[PDB]
């Protein structure tokens, strides 16, 4: 699977390692949520990450299924 | 009106200044929300404070109507 990631500069799409067959997006607010919106973490995973309180996580299993908000398709 | 405030040490109940007849509670997450819970700002106001996205603001108009979760 190919996933978007926020581990790179610029943000990019990567082929996930073997055994990591999901893409994920984890978002949460920090103190600047009211101006910059949610913090977004994108990457590859073997199992969908578990969420702590006030965090959201979604996973998906098609290429590039987890875009940053400023990189959604058109 | 007497309102709880988070501007004092320790946090306390204060007689609001003239023209400030509401108590308010304003909450948001910071980077520790997942462990410490929301940040809470308590005080007096003349009008209910404007809210930005991801902020919650609620006002009330009886004495000490806006307690901090840990004094409640």
């Amino acid at each position: 699977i190919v996933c978007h990631t926020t581990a790179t500069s610029p943000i990019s799409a990567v082929t996930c390692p073997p055994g990591e067959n999901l893409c994920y997006r984890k978002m949460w607010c920090d103190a600047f949520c009211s101006s910059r919106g949610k913090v977004v973490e994108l990457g590859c995973a073997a199992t969908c990450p578990s969420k702590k309180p006030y965090e959201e996580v979604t996973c998906c299993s098609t290429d590039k299924c987890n875009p940053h908000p400023k990189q959604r398709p058109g | 009106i007497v309102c709880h405030t988070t501007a004092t040490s320790p946090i306390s109940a204060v007689t609001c200044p003239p023209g400030e007849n509401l108590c308010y509670r304003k909450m948001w997450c910071d980077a520790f929300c997942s462990s410490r819970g929301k940040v809470v700002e308590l005080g007096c106001a003349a009008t209910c404070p404007s809210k930005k996205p991801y902020e919650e603001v609620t006002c009330c108009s009886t004495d000490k109507c806006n307690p901090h979760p840990k004094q409640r």
Partner: antibody
Amino acid sequence: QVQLVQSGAEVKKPGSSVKVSCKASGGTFSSYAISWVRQAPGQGLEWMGGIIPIFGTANYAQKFQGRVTITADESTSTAYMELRSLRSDDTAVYYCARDNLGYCSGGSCYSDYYYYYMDVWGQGTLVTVSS
Amino acid sequence: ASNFMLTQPRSVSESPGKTVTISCTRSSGSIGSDYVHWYQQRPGSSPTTVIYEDNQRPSGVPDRFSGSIDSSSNSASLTISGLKTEDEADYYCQSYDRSNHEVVFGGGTKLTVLE
């Protein structure tokens, strides 16, 4: 560079109480929490509770609730641990320790208790209880 | 009613210059649900923090100290590369039990340097 300075070692009879002090340099606790942590001889660290002066509230571990009282006076920046009904299992070194993450900044404060890492530790106080 | 446990090996011994890992396994609940921190306690001294928030180093702690989390084994680990005799001490992990509202300490690991 706050330091925490504790009172000295004591030797006690069973059934008595000990009240150990912890004075913070700088004249204030600000919005920090102070914990008490003890260590029986050759054993591990054990949390007893803590206090958050800016809220006027204290939190206790179940093992000690009802026998220990933790207090603090902002005016003297001193915290205290009073442990009553002393027994042999209470021979231990007692430490106070500051929670690195203050509870308030900018006129607002966190909603929930959550004991974070302990950055500044006192020097320890040995309390020895006879049989 | 009981807090979760954080289990550490009681003793670890290794030659200087080598890398040692000390693990801390959470007995119930996910390790990732709560930050893990690590303290060093030299004999006759108070604890000091070597790692906080799973993998952060306080100012002044050598970069030979690192922290990690392994979700599959529900553990946190402290790693010390380039082991030195001055690293001999007891090491404790620490987390927090939200249900009981209590700090939880691991049992401690005594690190000895073999000559």
